[PDB]
């Protein structure tokens, strides 16, 4: 029941030259929602974002700690971290603690720095790479998002189409779970611009 | 997870499913279980997916340093002995069921290693959630010195049998044929099932969702 | 041939390396400290910093705790490390014992660290002599001097650094109970003592003034200017 | 003699090894930094300008430490690399613990403490690397800091270390207008100083590297001038010199 | 459990807590203070498992004060918050965990007032208002249906009085007195506590 | 120039390590000579067996040590350090077998030996082992192999070689012999090795003064030829 | 040693004027099964002391190697001094007590008896470290069955003879065979006197 | 200043780490090695002469691979080169494991330079008496770096280390054009080895390696023979 | 000079001088001869009583490495005693980890490796005592190994370590150790030791003998006093 102590979920979506990120905005203890301004997705680069699902403390340890090592990689390499490198970089961060595992589920979604290839990935609590060309679901209410995406996702989706599918796919899932919800932020990333949107979700 | 391997006349043949399940929900239908170790050695990860991935890369990367030192192709026996010792050092705390297969100067070899840290040389071995299904197929159709072409069908049927007789494997079929003059990686060798079409357009048009606040920032 | 190792005794029982280290203290800007009934003063000389450099990072008077301040001489590299360790020690002592670190205790810890660094090879002695002064006694002013060797002493008024001999001679012949009966006269005594060592205009003297149950007050150049004007008026009266 | 090891004190009380390192810092190539009302900049001289040497990093002397800091280098190559790596580690560690950028002086003090520890404990040679620091922080804004092999840093408005550091510093003192320098004027002064700080005439663009710190819309962008703008500045200085000689 | 409630004003943060320390049968002390002076413009409120709270705050305080002196400038309230939390994350998985729920509030000149909610799992959060201990479910609603984005000083204290008044109505045991402090541009000040006759 | 030859980690003015060369020269202190000849399908090595005392036990003086049933070595130079290196080589072979399964090839075996020697030469902690380690052994897919790998840490592939006091002369004789391409047979290889040793030493080579060890493709096991086999080979060599 | 695997039967010993005699079975019973039936549970340490123990034979076997090397070192110095029966006993008491303190004690209830300078020594250090001196000692069950009998013979007559000692144990192990489920009808007898320590056996019963 | 030419942890009065310079001299006193970077790939060549015909020229290779797309040629002390190459391989594989991407030439070179510098900071450890020259093809751009015992690394377009390095550098800047190809680069490298090469350049005496986009590979004696015959 | 102050500094001509100095130190001590019977090994060391106040057995140079191994150190007695302790430790460890008596060859090799490890470091000095190991076993016959400070150790039919090593060897080569038994070989050893004795430079000595072989059931023990005198009687019979 560790994943239920703080609840929450983060959603990443892919389309035609676009990457979509959606995440819960509610923060609260296992029972009482303490705050509604939680940031469960953190930008690991100009066009790369990572959202973490699980215990808020472990999520925040992972968010800060990853940016600590990624900054060293960014400076040492002199180049923006490729999404695949960040994925495996996260995987090692989680796996170095197989015996003290971090109760956090990360999902990374973004475009390739060179070819602008949209990439999303998921990592288990023990650091398993999870590359999918259609979607990635992470959080406590995983079933709701995973079930809906099978019915809503469509390949070669336009930049605007990406938001609506990801939005409704997430807003629908959030209302069907109690531990996570109370507002959400959905980010749409395109090669020339980034659009930040927070859908009107049920505050219940 | 169903991994199987049969040593045919000229070498080894490997295969695995593509379903990784978190709890009772499958993570995806395409996840790769055939792990690259050396250009002449391969493995199929059964059990904890991340543990199977991490342990193989450590075993493969460690082997590569060894191979670069020798200038000769790594031999499978060097693959298991180093691999076996690592598992035991953890006295089974790592849940990774792996099968060693490949060819060397001494001929084809196939080694199966248990997650607890034990292994044995079996001309035909399978492991995973549906390890029983693959073993059943072997004992009814396998024969010594089997041909390369028929060997792939045997494993494909063996993996296919596990796909349609177990809840924890399927969604794709991948084989990694190993031979003295061939490394054929089959992603995917066959597609056991295809998702049914979508009869209903789901009308995801503009304006269907509302936004509390906006923030758009150009980049570059 | 007995001055190349810290732990080697000369035929006359001299630890020559520590004596050489004191020479480093002999090469720093003068520091004068005199304690009054309700005030403790730490005189200092500024070195007329370069025309194109900022003096904010040349702080020579630093406070170890909220009510204990030290002015050092010698090499700044070692003085900074000693100051940082003194601050950490004061915050640890407060942690273990809620009572704020006494000036005596901080001086003792500084001396202990210096001694530990001057006890074995592979560890160069701290070449900074620290004047630790503070009302930490909870109603009693105290001033201490930590030599680079490791021994500390309680001083009513002592001088360190270049010109220490002259400033000490001036302080001995002028520090009387009538002299420090009030804070203003104590500050005037500090200024007069530092004037003989540092012959220059304003901004060449930095005075750290701490009153009972208060915080450090690094006097602005104007206030030092006012006190120097007052001292000049007093000299005119004498003539 | 009293320079066998760093720990040894001379009778007069001088760390002979530390002084030797601070003197040897003069062998390093010239680098300088001028603090301007809108930002600070760094200038370095590429001593190695061989035609067979491929420029792959473009930042041999100017390194990025944090999103709001950068520090030039002067001294041994290995020591410089170790010091820059430690600087990056310290900055990122501070960011991880406090979640805000290091206020520049903290990083300078950490590096100076490391250098002091090296100059104190026996069996370690002093870091013969003196590196200029630049950056902006919410507490004091733009700052330029000088680090010596002895760990003694200090705030500075414009300094040059390495070859002919004395002449460059003196003539920066002669012609530096306090509180009235803009980034363009700062670059002009830096180019003027570098022209005569090095014996090489014409101040070839490939032989000089300039990096500037600016505060744009709360981002602290560190920009390394491309060869085109460096050539433009060199041509501007040449025309200014011609105009000045016009009086002759 | 104790009570840690805070309100984020337009230019100030008012944080209040009780003064009752009891050991499993009875209030041992009535003037016990449970809000710690992190710095001149930042305060700490640490409740939770006994023993741990009194010292972990003192350690966080020594290191927040230590930073204020080794640098000359006091740590920003957001930096302090990240640090106080950062320590807990390191020790939470260690063999000496700190089972303490803490509330942090202070004033930063550059940015403004802030109030961070700290859970015993060391999870940080910026919220306009928060409540700690068991009573949280009892007054968190009071803030929710009563809070305004521009609560004035006078109305701010009245709200806690209503918050405190409701607590005296339902809470099983006695909390005769509570601590009230205000953080503003000119510093942290002390206000009067509350009492209620029952004769 | 000559003042840099007292520590192993100090570079000479011209870019030389003098202690490594000194150990190389010390190799000759034993006064012995050893030669290895790599035939088409065999590897044969012969070393002098000096017993300058009637009370010695000739069975316990043999310098041909068997690292493994498939790999062989002949230590030339200082006896104690040679035996220590032989023990280390046995340990290395055993560990290689235990960690990777297949027997460690000779090249790898004393490449590990040479890496140990080099790590000795870099970090100044131990005097380099002054004993040349000549390895033989049949390797699958690479025929007979003889590798000489020495104190300084250099190992190379050798068709023929020798280490000891008379190394240059023996190597020159081998070069004169190795060049006339001919059937390198077991008997021919042993005869050429014994002939080279006899000419270099200018001795009649009584059967009790030489000790031979041969590894062959047909029998890939280190075998130390007895007195009878050596005498038969010598008589064949004479006629 | 947290779960004994191979254990031992009772060990009996009664001291007489001129020496001491001990006896033990030869049935190594893994659980309830007679895993081994030709093992020796009584071996000599020196010319004037001998010991035998119950419990894990492997744990006791470890003790055999320790004492042998520990005892062998005694004569290597060649100084004349040899570990007296009390000397071995004292080492044993601290040996197991030290081991027990670390939660890895030897599940091996030893008995050490010997003849030194005209006095007999019969000590027993339990699997945990308890040790005392008694004229007659029996390990494990022997305390329940044979031990009560030995007091009766000693209580009325504390002086015994070698033949009286020989059959006394036989009447002691005989009753052990009848009322025990782990005994075996093959035991050795250890006699220590001025002439030395002698071990013979086995022996059966009707 | 003969008094300070002994210890690596002490500064000379002029400020020279004497032992590092002496190690660099020892490096320059070794076997020749020349490498040229072409727009299509990189070429690495070293002269492999054994003192007699009794040495198996194929047993020890001066050009060795660090990964599928990194190379190594040296000029100086070979036993030190063996440990250097082992450390380089370990560093490359550690980077691969942590990041699952082949280590870029720049990062592998930087870590090898760090390893080299690790030995030049404490008394009792002799600086690596070999200067490595690293090939590479990462991100579709050929790379060539040289790591020295002092720890400094550069981005040599084309240079020759070891004995007769002045002549090799002079030959370069003459026959080197920035817009060559792999075959022309190989020919130039062979010629550069020739101008500092004593005796006939046999197939077994000169060892070369092309390190283009396809990866690093040591040319077998057959290809080297063909190239030398073409040049000859 | 210059290269002979530490044991880790190779001489310019290639010789570790400290090892040779330790060999000279062992050469500066009294003689100790080990002669191998056809059925055993006999040790005999001339133990000089430096003063009449000694207890006729003090600082004896014959040490029992193990039950079957006898050691006949000669040289610096402190180093010899330390080596005896190390040899006993190695024998005990070998027996514990393998269960059978450590073969004299393997024990000698391990002790020689330990000795040689002390001539490779600058912080330690070579042992100043040379020792010979002797043992008998029906399985592996009688073996007599001598290990000097250099670390070299190969078997010997008969060896002498000390001042008159050459004199002892001159009259030991004139003895047929191949066939004789360990009964008359003891008398031969006593006579040979008595021959090699200054008696004008050394005031007096206390001959001490030792043997290990079939006559001693394979164990090494001090030669019985009853027959030790017989050896002394034979030595006295020999005029020298």
Short mmCIF file of C-alpha atoms in Angstrom, two decimals, chain D residues 40-194:
data_model
loop_
_atom_site.label_atom_id
_atom_site.label_comp_id
_atom_site.label_asym_id
_atom_site.label_seq_id
_atom_site.Cartn_x
_atom_site.Cartn_y
_atom_site.Cartn_z
CA UNK D 40 30.53 40.80 -16.38
CA UNK D 41 32.81 39.29 -19.01
CA UNK D 42 35.96 37.20 -19.31
CA UNK D 43 38.83 37.32 -21.80
CA UNK D 44 41.41 34.60 -22.41
CA UNK D 45 44.34 34.06 -24.76
CA UNK D 46 44.74 30.75 -26.60
CA UNK D 47 48.47 30.13 -26.28
CA UNK D 48 48.27 27.02 -28.50
CA UNK D 49 47.23 28.27 -31.95
CA UNK D 50 48.81 25.58 -34.10
CA UNK D 51 47.12 24.98 -37.45
CA UNK D 52 47.03 21.22 -36.80
CA UNK D 53 45.06 21.66 -33.54
CA UNK D 54 41.32 21.18 -34.00
CA UNK D 55 39.11 23.39 -31.83
CA UNK D 56 36.44 21.00 -30.54
CA UNK D 57 35.35 22.64 -27.28
CA UNK D 58 35.93 26.38 -27.88
CA UNK D 59 36.07 26.79 -24.08
CA UNK D 60 39.59 25.69 -23.19
CA UNK D 61 39.95 28.53 -20.67
CA UNK D 62 36.30 29.43 -19.96
CA UNK D 63 34.12 26.79 -18.31
CA UNK D 64 30.45 26.79 -17.33
CA UNK D 65 29.99 25.79 -13.69
CA UNK D 66 26.29 26.49 -13.06
CA UNK D 67 23.28 28.02 -14.79
CA UNK D 68 24.40 31.37 -13.34
CA UNK D 69 28.18 30.95 -12.95
CA UNK D 70 31.27 30.56 -15.12
CA UNK D 71 34.96 30.64 -14.26
CA UNK D 72 38.00 31.10 -16.46
CA UNK D 73 41.19 29.17 -15.73
CA UNK D 74 44.93 29.83 -15.58
CA UNK D 75 47.51 27.30 -14.46
CA UNK D 76 48.29 23.61 -14.79
CA UNK D 77 45.93 21.71 -17.07
CA UNK D 78 45.34 18.73 -14.78
CA UNK D 79 44.89 20.94 -11.73
CA UNK D 80 42.55 23.20 -13.70
CA UNK D 81 40.42 20.26 -14.82
CA UNK D 82 40.22 18.84 -11.30
CA UNK D 83 39.30 22.25 -9.90
CA UNK D 84 36.57 22.82 -12.50
CA UNK D 85 35.11 19.36 -11.88
CA UNK D 86 35.10 20.02 -8.13
CA UNK D 87 33.47 23.41 -8.75
CA UNK D 88 30.68 21.79 -10.75
CA UNK D 89 30.22 19.13 -8.07
CA UNK D 90 30.06 21.73 -5.30
CA UNK D 91 27.59 23.91 -7.19
CA UNK D 92 25.28 21.00 -7.99
CA UNK D 93 25.51 19.67 -4.43
CA UNK D 94 24.49 23.08 -3.11
CA UNK D 95 21.63 23.19 -5.62
CA UNK D 96 20.44 19.75 -4.52
CA UNK D 97 20.54 20.56 -0.77
CA UNK D 98 19.15 24.14 -0.94
CA UNK D 99 17.34 24.12 -4.34
CA UNK D 100 18.68 27.56 -5.30
CA UNK D 101 21.79 28.69 -7.19
CA UNK D 102 24.98 29.08 -5.19
CA UNK D 103 25.56 32.78 -4.43
CA UNK D 104 28.88 32.73 -6.27
CA UNK D 105 30.92 33.60 -3.19
CA UNK D 106 29.92 30.27 -1.66
CA UNK D 107 31.47 28.37 -4.58
CA UNK D 108 34.55 30.60 -4.46
CA UNK D 109 34.95 29.97 -0.73
CA UNK D 110 34.48 26.22 -1.15
CA UNK D 111 37.18 26.04 -3.81
CA UNK D 112 39.46 28.25 -1.73
CA UNK D 113 38.92 25.97 1.27
CA UNK D 114 39.84 22.94 -0.84
CA UNK D 115 43.00 24.69 -2.01
CA UNK D 116 43.87 25.73 1.55
CA UNK D 117 43.42 22.15 2.74
CA UNK D 118 45.81 21.04 0.00
CA UNK D 119 48.36 23.70 0.99
CA UNK D 120 48.14 22.64 4.65
CA UNK D 121 48.13 18.82 4.80
CA UNK D 122 51.49 17.29 4.00
CA UNK D 123 52.07 15.14 0.96
CA UNK D 124 50.02 17.34 -1.39
CA UNK D 125 51.36 20.00 -3.73
CA UNK D 126 49.48 23.32 -3.90
CA UNK D 127 47.00 23.68 -6.74
CA UNK D 128 48.87 25.90 -9.17
CA UNK D 129 45.60 27.07 -10.73
CA UNK D 130 44.34 30.64 -10.35
CA UNK D 131 40.89 30.99 -11.89
CA UNK D 132 38.59 33.99 -12.24
CA UNK D 133 34.94 33.60 -11.25
CA UNK D 134 31.92 35.39 -12.69
CA UNK D 135 28.21 35.12 -11.97
CA UNK D 136 25.00 36.71 -10.70
CA UNK D 137 23.14 35.99 -7.47
CA UNK D 138 20.03 37.37 -5.82
CA UNK D 139 22.14 38.80 -2.98
CA UNK D 140 24.73 40.97 -4.78
CA UNK D 141 24.15 40.46 -8.50
CA UNK D 142 27.08 40.50 -10.89
CA UNK D 143 30.42 39.70 -9.25
CA UNK D 144 33.96 38.82 -10.34
CA UNK D 145 36.15 36.83 -7.97
CA UNK D 146 39.85 35.95 -8.12
CA UNK D 147 41.21 32.67 -6.77
CA UNK D 148 44.91 32.10 -6.12
CA UNK D 149 46.82 28.87 -5.48
CA UNK D 150 46.81 29.74 -1.77
CA UNK D 151 43.02 29.84 -1.46
CA UNK D 152 42.97 33.62 -0.92
CA UNK D 153 40.12 34.95 -3.06
CA UNK D 154 38.78 38.47 -3.34
CA UNK D 155 36.16 40.59 -5.05
CA UNK D 156 37.47 42.47 -8.06
CA UNK D 157 36.05 44.78 -10.72
CA UNK D 158 38.62 43.95 -13.42
CA UNK D 159 41.66 41.68 -13.15
CA UNK D 160 44.07 39.79 -15.39
CA UNK D 161 46.12 36.73 -14.46
CA UNK D 162 48.83 34.92 -16.36
CA UNK D 163 51.26 36.50 -18.79
CA UNK D 164 51.91 40.21 -18.19
CA UNK D 165 49.14 40.31 -15.60
CA UNK D 166 50.77 43.36 -13.99
CA UNK D 167 50.59 45.56 -17.09
CA UNK D 168 47.02 44.53 -17.91
CA UNK D 169 45.85 45.15 -14.35
CA UNK D 170 47.65 48.50 -14.12
CA UNK D 171 46.22 49.84 -17.36
CA UNK D 172 42.78 48.54 -16.44
CA UNK D 173 43.13 50.59 -13.25
CA UNK D 174 44.19 53.56 -15.38
CA UNK D 175 41.19 53.50 -17.73
CA UNK D 176 38.37 51.72 -15.85
CA UNK D 177 35.47 54.08 -15.14
CA UNK D 178 33.78 52.78 -12.00
CA UNK D 179 30.03 52.28 -12.32
CA UNK D 180 29.93 53.65 -15.88
CA UNK D 181 30.84 50.61 -18.01
CA UNK D 182 28.35 48.83 -20.26
CA UNK D 183 28.84 45.38 -21.74
CA UNK D 184 29.81 46.91 -25.09
CA UNK D 185 32.24 49.26 -23.35
CA UNK D 186 33.46 46.36 -21.22
CA UNK D 187 34.21 44.31 -24.34
CA UNK D 188 35.95 47.29 -25.94
CA UNK D 189 38.15 47.73 -22.87
CA UNK D 190 38.86 44.00 -22.72
CA UNK D 191 39.96 43.94 -26.36
CA UNK D 192 42.08 47.05 -25.83
CA UNK D 193 43.77 45.41 -22.84
CA UNK D 194 44.33 42.09 -24.60
#
